[PDB]
């Protein structure tokens, strides 16, 4: 599944993604850490908060 960024988010650790409104995050997986997702943006994989994004359907 892919997700679309709806709200800007800045990474606070090196394993999170810095993401921007309109960007598509690819190959997105739900994680054990509740409220967090993992996917790929501009070649890099990291985690980002799920309420900044919306699942493309």
């Amino acid at each position: 599944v892919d997700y679309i960024v709806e709200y800007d988010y800045d990474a606070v650790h090196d394993d999170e993604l810095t993401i921007r409104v309109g960007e598509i995050i690819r190959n997105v997986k739900k994680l054990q850490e509740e409220g967090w997702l993992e996917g790929e943006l501009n070649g890099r994989r990291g985690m980002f908060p799920d309420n900044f994004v919306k699942e493309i359907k």
Partner: peptide
């Protein structure tokens, strides 16, 4: 830990 950042 990781919070759940707020919109």
């Amino acid at each position: 830990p990781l919070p759940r950042p707020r919109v």
